[PDB]
Design a binder for this molecule. Structure first.
Ligand SMILES: *[C@@H]1O[C@H](CO)[C@@H](O)[C@H](O)[C@H]1NC(C)=O
Ligand SMILES: *[C@@H]1O[C@H](CO)[C@@H](O)[C@H](O)[C@H]1NC(C)=O
Ligand SMILES: *[C@@H]1O[C@H](CO)[C@@H](O)[C@H](O)[C@H]1NC(C)=O
Ligand SMILES: *[C@@H]1O[C@H](CO)[C@@H](O)[C@H](O)[C@H]1NC(C)=O
Ligand SMILES: *[C@@H]1O[C@H](CO)[C@@H](O)[C@H](O)[C@H]1NC(C)=O
Ligand SMILES: *[C@@H]1O[C@H](CO)[C@@H](O)[C@H](O)[C@H]1NC(C)=O
Ligand SMILES: *[C@@H]1O[C@H](CO)[C@@H](O)[C@H](O)[C@H]1NC(C)=O
Lengths: 49, 245, 91
């Protein structure tokens, strides 16, 4: 005899330190192609959606 | 100055994040050997082999900061740790030139005890990756153990008031910063140093009911300790016991 | 252009259920068991718990500051008590 599971749950810590993808995309003024900006996005949760 | 002193059961830290109550656990990790000899440093680059144990005591805040790296040149990335009065900055950024550490001609505290806004040791701040800011590391005796295992740099700390004194004090984890750099040398900075080096030993920690380490035994010091580790107990009864080969 | 080469996508969560045999996943600590509150006191930095037989006993959920035990939901064998089949048929 064995009691089968009734549900499956997954717990992870709060989401915070979301990457600055918001800042990159909504720049008021971009630069010309010859001098293109670059941002090393590191150590953050991406959330590409 | 390299005067030597023995470490009386100092340099014990929590190996894992798990919790154990009223049970003896045997673990095989890097540790400072019991009754090993340490080196006092006074007013040189250390070899930093397989971890380090840092300890210092003073009534002032003269001691602050550390620098780590394998070459201290532009070829390889270098690491910095510096504590402010109210914050700490930990940026792994390359540093090229170091003409001389700052040192006032007088450096007399009998008349003037103000030394502020005089920190410039990095000649060039080249491209780098990581930067962490948190609560001050320092606040009594301060004990720190620095490790670099599997790309993770781990820092442990503990504040033990004194009257390396005898006793047992467990080092709790503080900040596991993920630099990823290779570290082969380290050096301390100024505004009484205890330096010890770890070896791949095996220990037998004793966990309290609340979950804190109270006692530990090194399984490679004397045959009695080997017998204790084999029996997994701190009290051995009368008899003959086989320990090793 | 987002070139690719610590940076990992957000992992969503699920509501906490107690007193039922539920599959759980606490920061990659997969297992099965019942979830009940515990009168233990972990250290501030500890997250898991482990008994003498190296089996997860208590786990702290990453979101709220609470610690709960992990007990396997009931299992075991079954037996049938019957007289002689000629004597009767009830079991
Ligand atoms: C180890 O420490 C002792 C002091 O207890 C000292 O005499 C000895 O020289 C040290 N070992 C080495 C290799 O210097
Ligand atoms: C901490 O000290 C560094 C050293 O230059 C300084 O750049 C930084 O601004 C200080 N932190 C704060 C919060 O002022
Ligand atoms: C950072 O600077 C070093 C020093 O020249 C260089 O070799 C490296 O390509 C630069 N970029 C990265 C991502 O390390
Ligand atoms: C560190 O050392 C390892 C092997 O000793 C080597 O593969 C690696 O390239 C070195 N540098 C870094 C940044 O890991
Ligand atoms: C465990 O913690 C409780 C609550 O702080 C305390 O009363 C008890 O003395 C502790 N046990 C020790 C220190 O062995
Ligand atoms: C996550 O968010 C909840 C919202 O109620 C909060 O209670 C909890 O403290 C947060 N996580 C942390 C930092 O414990
Ligand atoms: C059950 O009991 C009856 C009466 O005692 C007997 O006749 C019969 O043979 C028994 N059944 C078997 C399988 O022996």
């Amino acid at each position: 005899f064995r009691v089968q599971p009734t549900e499956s749950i997954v717990r992870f810590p709060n989401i915070t330190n979301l990457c600055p993808f918001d800042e990159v995309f909504n720049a008021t003024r971009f630069a010309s192609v010859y001098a293109w900006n670059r941002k090393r996005i590191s150590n953050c949760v991406a959330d590409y959606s | 100055t390299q005067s030597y002193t023995n470490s009386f059961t100092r340099g014990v830290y929590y190996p894992d994040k798990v919790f154990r109550s009223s049970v003896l656990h045997s673990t095989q990790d890097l540790f400072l050997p019991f009754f090993s000899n340490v080196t006092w440093f006074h007013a040189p680059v250390l070899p930093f082999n397989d971890g380090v144990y840092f300890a210092s005591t003073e009534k002032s805040n003269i001691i602050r900061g550390w620098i780590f790296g394998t070459t201290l040149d532009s070829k390889t990335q270098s690491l910095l740790i510096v504590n402010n009065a109210t914050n700490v900055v930990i940026k792994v950024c390359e540093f090229q030139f170091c003409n001389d550490p700052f040192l006032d001609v007088y450096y007399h505290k009998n008349n003037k005890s103000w030394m502020e806004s005089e920190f410039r040791v990095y000649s060039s701040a080249n491209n780098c990756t990581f930067e962490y800011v948190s609560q001050p590391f320092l606040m009594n005796l301060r004990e720190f153990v620095f490790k670099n295992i599997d790309g993770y740099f781990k820092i442990y700390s503990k504040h033990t008031p004194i009257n390396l004194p005898q006793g047992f004090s467990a080092l709790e984890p503080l900040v596991d910063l993920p630099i990823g750099i290779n570290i082969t040398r380290f050096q301390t900075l100024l505004a009484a140093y205890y330096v010890g080096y770890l070896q791949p030993r095996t220990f037998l920690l004793k966990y309290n009911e609340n979950g804190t380490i109270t006692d530990a035994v090194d399984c490679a010091l004397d045959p009695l300790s080997e017998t204790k580790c084999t029996l997994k107990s701190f009290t051995v009864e009368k008899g003959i016991y086989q320990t090793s080969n | 252009v987002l070139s690719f080469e610590t940076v990992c996508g957000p992992k969503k969560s699920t509501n906490l259920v107690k007193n039922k045999c539920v599959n759980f996943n606490f920061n990659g600590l997969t297992g099965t068991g019942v979830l009940t509150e515990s009168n233990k006191k972990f250290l501030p930095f500890q997250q898991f718990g482990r008994d003498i037989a190296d089996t997860t006993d208590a786990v702290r959920d990453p979101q709220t500051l609470e610690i709960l035990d992990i007990t396997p939901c009931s299992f075991g064998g079954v037996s049938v008590i019957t007289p002689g089949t000629n004597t009767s048929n009830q079991v």
